[model samples]
Target: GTGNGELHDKFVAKGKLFFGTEIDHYHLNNQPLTNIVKSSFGQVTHENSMKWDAIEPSRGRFSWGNADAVVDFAVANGKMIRGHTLVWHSQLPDWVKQINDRNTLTQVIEDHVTAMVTRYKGKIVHWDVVNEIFSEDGNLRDSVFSRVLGEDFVGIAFRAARAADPNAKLYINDYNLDNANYAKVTRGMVEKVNRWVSQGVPIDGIGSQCHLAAPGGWNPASQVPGALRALAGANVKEIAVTELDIAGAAANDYLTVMNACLQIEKCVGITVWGVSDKDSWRQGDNPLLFDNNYQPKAAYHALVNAL
Candidate 1:
């Protein structure tokens, strides 16, 4: 038995796609962090370096080198990359949001998507082409993109991504889809996905951003599988547990997600939001698989054992 069947390796053995973590440049120089990343994770999503604000803070100026460093590290370690987002409401710079004209906004979105996708065309395997456009109430969120371009913004970004790199899987990623209380948003998303697919839009998958809370705060057993099945029923080809992190690092909480994905054929992979709690967005909540010391926690072992 090949004994290195730890977290990500064990996942592939069980027939899913790559298991991954989110990373930024801060952790690359740390030996222990890099060591764990190289051994345990099969892929990576840059936490912030690839966001709209970081990548293109000013009009016509691209900070390609920031994201490039992270991608280069992942490549050197033999891990695939998950492009965090091409179009999202948050972390977006002011210029794109301030555009008052629909035509100008559309061109800006298309240009950004095309440039990002084409540059990383061959390296990235999945792209979260759009993120968090749908509100929890099942209505399109009011943003500069939505206000000006209407719902057509989604289609435009995805179509541009496909044209740039047809092989890379394009995804619509959002949070709370796996929560029991957000059935309306989930249904609305599936409805939108079906419409987009029917109209020949180029979405290849759905990304469930499972930022779950602590023990007994919610039920993943039903909601997780329920959401995955709902999207699959709508003919969405693939699904991934994108941006996963359990508050307080509950072993049971983490296991619930990994277990649900394992049972579902269409749930392709899972990516914890970050490697450890040291630098999590949900600071002090200890929501990741490792501790600040870069040591594997019970949650990490739980995922491995369950797999």
Candidate 2:
């Protein structure tokens, strides 16, 4: 076990919930990052290694080298793994783009979800089975999967994932669900969830990609509870604050979001997008809990004390 000061230890001491961080394999061997993972996080997510393009560059041919490495590392370290995604419009393979027929696309979806989810069946605790399929305005985004299979594609994807890993928690992950204008996005997402549940689709959770920014004018502290409440109203088993990073007002924002999660019983976990500002996808945005040198930021201190 980590020391009492470790974030994961502190959070777990307060409740059953745990904290996680997204990581790429390139930094898996970085001693500093390895240390942080062991000390701070109770769970881990592959930042990109599990995406379609990265996992299956060619149709029916899969590469699990990087993702496998991540899973191994997580298991060896006693951290639960969350599969980043099994289906998405972005980060898709070229073969998917070339396929026009619905039959082929449907097979593609089934095969990918089945194989990926099955491979990590007992190892992964949660899977973002589908990601970013909706626009901020609460409309379904047009993608190769959506274009070919229509709205039912979401149902098919979830069904396939459930069949592949019946025990693993499945979630639909999206951004803007906790924005100031959350009703629009949350309603849209709930509608989608309703469609799935009404038709007997299997979905266990919702992932709010709280990619916050100070200038973005979305108050996560104020808006996140409403979003979680909306999702809870949809009857999902749990919710997670996925991909969280604040580019502005770190300390207050972290506290606010953490408090919101604490208030919601179904909000099971919070995963920061990256460990430090240096590793963040929004690099120059300063959107993480740590600074460039892996030092804890004010936000990190605030989160621990707040807990």
Candidate 3:
């Protein structure tokens, strides 16, 4: 039996927020896989095709084949899209690393952000303008962007993205925000987001990549609400659980996370990282709501019931 409009639609109906998943381009052409995505999610996010390396492998030369496929599919299906990321430390192209001149590097960042965000424009609902800028220790990551342009690089990227698509919501996305052990980093992210907004960075949302564990996962009950409150307290108008997956656990973890999100008005939505275990980046651990064959897992039903 095909599991149609089960988990995602149910969550949207109950949570009154969008439910989505990160999809890879390879599976978009697979009928069964595509069908499953179409029936389940109200929104879609690219797993990796929009990253700097994939889009701009070389300076001044951009590739749109991979990203275009995902964007086109989302538009055809009338599903909302969240552009994965515009500036990130990982998956950067070699050319970006070779640039030693700070001014050139700054220009490169602006150009990339402007081009990518402008291309999608009104098609995408959200844009992850800056991703993973803070380290686990509450310090700015020493990536090429941070090193070359200092902390101002984040503001630069956000501004460029805003100028390109003033209509689309822009966000700063990151992980480890829902774990108390990483409280420092969580607070640090809020502070940075607050500073950016106050300084006219045009950030519209905050993405907490709630990649949690199984039943024994971190304190979702407390940590999730705590994180949401902190972000909302910082005047964050929208918050989304960007990359969510629960590995090796039951539906209770899913329930806890969803309920916590429900309690916070600013919490916008939750997007599972992948559709099934096989497609998941953390393959073999069965970290998703569906199995490899697109069958709904126990956690899927549990999430539905929880909602």
Q: Select the stronger candidate by TM-score from 1 and 3.
A: 1
Q: What is the lDDT of residue 212 in candidate 1?
A: 74
* Model number with the top lDDT: 1
Q: lDDT tens string, model 3, 111-218? A: 999989888889988898888988777778888877877888888888888888888888888887875446544557877777778887788888988776555555
lDDT of 1 by residue, 1-307 (tens): 5339689889888898889998888877888888888999999999898889898888878999879999999888889899988999998998887897888898999888988998987999999999998877777788998898878998899999999998899999888777544654455678888888998888889888888766556634335666666665666888888998877877876777788888878888999988878878896878898898989999888888776
Model 2 agreement with the true structure over 1-307: per-residue lDDT tens digits: 4356878887777664679998989988788778898899999999989999999999989999999998999999999998989889998888898998988888888999999998888998888988998876777788887778878788888899888888899899988777534654555778778778788888898888888767446544556666667776776778888888877536877888877877778888889988988888998878888888988888888888776
All candidates in order of lDDT, best leading: 1, 2, 3
Q: Rate the local accuracy (lDDT) of all candidates.
A: 0.84, 0.83, 0.80
Q: What value does the lDDT take at residue 287 in candidate 1?
A: 89
After superposing candidate 2, which stretches have Cα over 4 Å from the reference? 1-3, 180-184, 215-221
Deviation of model 3 at 56, angstroms: 0.6
lDDT over C-alpha atoms for residue 270 of model 3: 82
TM-score of each: 0.95, 0.94, 0.93
Clashing pairs in 2: none
What are the RMSD figures for all models against the true structure? 1.7, 1.8, 2.6
How many backbone clashes does every candidate have? 0, 0, 0
